[PDB]
Amino acid sequence: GAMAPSYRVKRMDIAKNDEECVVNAANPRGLPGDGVCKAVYKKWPESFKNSATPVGTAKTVMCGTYPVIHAVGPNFSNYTESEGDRELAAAYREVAKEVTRLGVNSVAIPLLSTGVYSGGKDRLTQSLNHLFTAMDSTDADVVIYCRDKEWEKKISEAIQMRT
Ligand SMILES: c1ccc2[nH]ncc2c1
Ligand SMILES: [Cl-]
Ligand SMILES: [Cl-]
Ligand SMILES: [Cl-]
């Protein structure tokens, strides 16, 4: 575990992370995809061997010795708000299990279902609160990666609020 487990946020490409493992915002079919998923495919293509897994689950594949945790959030274009919320919570619980199993002291994580799976809605708060519910009982240093300058401020504020 980390000596004083923390949450941090960085605005940069998760493919350049400084953590002991990475969470991919995966599709269920283990396809290269776009956004976070395509950057992850370009950096760790070996991790996409038999990475396909259902919605609400996480599947780890090693790229050398570096773990890639493929976490499949719901596409809110297809799910109801209620069912989507349940699957988004579940995907993060499966990430917490994998992070624990791997024995890593740090993890880079994107906000699941906030991009092309968002169904055109702002899900920063919904996705971040499910991230916290899952990861609060783990002792890994968590570093959340985002792209948008206003999202960085709001994630930083949410972390600071609970400290
Ligand atoms: C992908 C490419 C460039 C980027 N700059 N900040 C976040 C990010 C993600
Ligand atoms: Cl970058
Ligand atoms: Cl997404
Ligand atoms: Cl973002």
Residue from 9, 10, 11, 13 whose mutation best tests the ligand 1 pocket (most atoms within 8 A of CB): 13
Residue closest via CA to ligand 1's atom 8 equals: 13
Q: What are phi and psi of 78, to 5 degrees?
A: -105, -35
Query: What is the rounded CA–CA span in Å between residue 112 and residue 138?
Result: 18
| 124-135 helix and 81-102 helix, angle to the nearest 10 degrees | 40
Residue 115 marked as a ligand binder: yes
Residue 78, class by beta-carbon neighbours within 10 Å (0-12 exposed, 13-18 middle, 19+ buried)? exposed
Q: What is the resolution of this structure in A?
A: 1.5
Compute how many other C-beta atoms are within 10 angstroms of the C-beta atom of residue 28.
Answer: 17
79 CA to centre of ligand 2 in angstroms? 31
Q: Is 41 annotated as a binding residue?
A: no
SS (H, E, C) the chain: CCCCCCEEEEECCHHHCCCCCEEEECCCCCCCCCCHHHHHHHHCHHHHCCCCCCCCCEEEEEECCEEEEEECCCCCCCCCHHHHHHHHHHHHHHHHHHHHHHCCCEEEEECCCCCCCCCCCCCHHHHHHHHHHHHCCCCCEEEEEECCHHHHHHHHHHHHHCC
- Whether the CA torsion 69, 118, 32, 153 is positive or negative: it is negative
| CB proximity list for 80: less than 8 A, separation 6 or greater | none
**Residue located via tokens 């990430």:** 95
Residue nearest to atom 9 of ligand 1 (CA): 13
How many angstroms separate the Cα of 37 from the Cα of each of 98, 138, 144? 18, 24, 15
Distance, in Å, from the CA atom of 105 to the CA atom of 20, rounded to the nearest integer, reads: 7
Q: How far apart are CA 18 and CA 108, in angstroms?
A: 8
Pocket of ligand 1 (CB under 6 A): 11-13, 39, 147
Alpha carbons 118 and 51: distance in angstroms, whole number: 22
Amino acid at the residue 59: K
Taking CA atoms only, the protein residue closest to ligand 1 atom 5 is: 12
